[PDB]
Structures are given as C-alpha cells and as structure tokens.
C-alpha cells in the first residue's frame, strides 16, 4: 500500500501543483503520458471538491482517464498536456490573492472541469481549416466556432461512458448552472472572441469596485463569468508567461502542428494560413507579433484586474518577448 518508486517522483513533481511554471512534461513522462488525469486527481483532492460534490473517486478516475484517452497524442500542441497545463494555469489563476473567496466551489469545479474539456479531440487544424475543407465538424456547427463547440459535445458525451457521470450526486439545479458557465468558458475560448472578451475585461478594469478587503466584488453572472472567461483564456495564451524552458518546448509543438496543417494546405491549395509556412515563415516573428498584439495586452489587462498578483508573470512575459526580439536575424 506505498507508492512505486516513479509514483514517488511523480508526486515529488505534482508538489509544485500551485506555482506558475510547473514541469509539466516531466509529469507526462513520469505519469505514463497521463498529465490530465494526475494533475486533475491532484487539483480535486487539494480543493476538496470529491467531497464537496459527492464525486466516487473511481468514477473521478475512469471519467479523466477517458477524457484524456480521447485527446489525440499524434497532434503535437494541442494534446493532453496542453489541457493539463491550462488546467494547472487556471488552478493557479483561482488562487490569487485579489480572488481570495470570490468564487464558490461550482465556479471554481466550472473553470476546471472548462480547462480539462477545453480542446478535447483537437484533430491539430484550425476551424478555418476545417470550414475550407468542407470538414463533417464544420458542417455539424454550421461553420461557427467549430472545435470549440465539439470539445464542449464531447467533454460532455463522455460522462455517459461506463462509470464516468462525475456529476451523478449534483442537483439538477447544480447541474444546469454548472454547464451553462461550462459552455460560457469554453466558447470563450475561440481566439474569433480575444477582442470582446478583452475589451469587457477592459472595461471591468475602469469599472473595478473592490470590497471590505482589497478582494474584487463581482455582484452579477455576467461579470462572474467574464472573470472566469478572461481567466481561462488566459490559462490557454499563457505558453509565454512561463519559463523559456517551458515557453520554447510550447512553441516547437505549435510549429509542428502549424507547419503540418502548413503541409497539409499546400497539396489541398485553398492558400497557406498566417504565417503557417516552414519557407517564407519566421519562428521569433511570429511569437513577437502574438506577445505585442495578443498576449501582452491580455496579460497586462489580466494584471491590472488583480494587481499587483500578476506582476511576476508579467515580468517573465517581457523577458521573453525581448528574448525572442534578441534572436531575430
Ligand atoms: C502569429 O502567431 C503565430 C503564428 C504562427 C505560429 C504561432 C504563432 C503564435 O504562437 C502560438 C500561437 C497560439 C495560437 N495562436 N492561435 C491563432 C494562430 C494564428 C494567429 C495568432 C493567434 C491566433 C491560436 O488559436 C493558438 C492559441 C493555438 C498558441 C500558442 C503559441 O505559441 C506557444
Ligand atoms: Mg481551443
Ligand atoms: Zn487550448
């Protein structure tokens, strides 16, 4: 009834389970390529939510591994680990400070559960991919937030596989609240919505009522859930925020996928996609661009909403911006 020497390393890793820049990868390699399911099992007990919501241990356990089952591991970025470092990301994003008991325990089980399904049988190509290529996901969503909408339908279907329903003690009321800021996150996660959500997180920045404590009061759905939208976005766009180490490993597999999809829309035609092409298409460039014109102004949103939380993470972005700006040729 011990752990096995690599369980042992393993959870030596997962203690670095609340800090920004987790070895995400070692823990894939140390878990058997189950990041999802460990860091999901890890963040549940810490936040007591088996308890909370009833959830069997065993149903926790066959429902991730059947969730991480059905994220393809021949897609290079957005596979398994990515959704267990979104996961994590978003986990360590509930804890700050400025949020310090905002959320009750079904928002919080909400951006989780959002994280772990946020881009589940991701086939490795983009919706406009998938619109051009007359692509049977395309034609079911008629044409509107393709993958978005399929990693919501089958985060979902999944919870009626053998021992899988997680959510089998909740009330239908909880259930019903639950899926709705399940969907409302998820969706949220269309890069087409970057500059609305960024814009009413603006907004809520100018707007910004404080409470007793230096904790931000957010007294309507529709501010609680625009946080818990900006904040799992920003969990899925934080690949820069995090050490260069992790950062770079991050941009090989957003490259790989790129440049195959990159491969793919060359002998299809239909034209090759922003800047998704291994000849006239630059690596640094491009994630200068994507810091300057996406994740600078998000974080730095991000940063005044929870200021001075976000400082360090920040910082660790403009390092790595100036890093990619030093390397350009
Ligand atoms: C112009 O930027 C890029 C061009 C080509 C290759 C890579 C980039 C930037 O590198 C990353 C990009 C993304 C995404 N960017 N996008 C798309 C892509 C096209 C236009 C840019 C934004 C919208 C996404 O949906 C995700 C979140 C997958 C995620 C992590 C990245 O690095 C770790
Ligand atoms: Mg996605
Ligand atoms: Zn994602």
New binding site residues.
């Given amino acids: 009834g011990v752990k096995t020497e690599q369980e042992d390393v393993l959870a030596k890793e997962l203690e670095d389970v609340n800090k920004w820049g987790l070895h995400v990868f070692r823990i894939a390699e140390l878990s058997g390529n189950r990041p999802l399911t460990v860091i999901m099992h890890t963040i549940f007990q810490e936040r007591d939510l088996l308890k909370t919501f009833k959830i069997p241990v065993d149903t926790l356990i066959t429902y991730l591994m059947t969730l991480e089952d059905h994220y393809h591991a021949d897609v290079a970025?957005?596979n398994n680990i990515h959704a267990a470092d979104v996961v994590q990301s978003t986990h360590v994003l509930l804890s700050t400070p400025a949020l310090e008991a905002v959320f009750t325990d079904l928002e919080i089980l909400a951006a989780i559960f959002a994280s772990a399904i946020h881009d589940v049988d991701h086939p490795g190509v983009?919706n406009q991919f998938l619109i051009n290529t007359n692509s049977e996901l395309a034609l079911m969503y008629n044409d509107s937030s393709v993958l978005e909408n399929h990693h919501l339908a089958v985060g979902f279907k999944l919870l009626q596989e053998e021992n899988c329903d997680i959510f089998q003690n909740l009330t239908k009321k909880q259930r019903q609240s639950l899926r709705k800021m399940v969907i409302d996150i998820v969706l949220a996660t269309d890069?087409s919505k970057h500059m609305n959500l960024l814009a009413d997180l603006k907004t809520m920045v100018e707007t910004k009522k404080v409470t007793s404590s230096g904790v931000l009061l957010l007294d309507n759905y529709s501010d609680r859930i625009q946080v818990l939208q900006n904040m799992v976005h920003c969990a899925?766009?934080s690949?820069?925020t995090k050490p260069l180490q992790l950062?770079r490993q991050?941009?090989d597999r957003?490259?790989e996928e790129?440049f195959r999809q990159g491969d793919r829309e060359r002998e299809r035609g239909m034209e090759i996609?922003?800047?998704?092409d291994k000849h006239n298409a630059s690596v640094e460039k491009?994630?200068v661009?994507?810091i300057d014109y996406?994740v600078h102004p998000l974080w730095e949103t991000w940063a005044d909403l929870v200021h001075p939380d976000a400082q360090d993470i920040l910082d660790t972005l403009e390092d790595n911006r100036e890093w990619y700006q030093s390397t350009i040729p």
Avoid at 273 to 276: A, L, N, Q, W
């Fill in positions: 970025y957005h983009s890069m899925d766009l690949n820069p950062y991050w941009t957003i490259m790129f996609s922003p800047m998704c491009s994630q661009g994507f996406i």
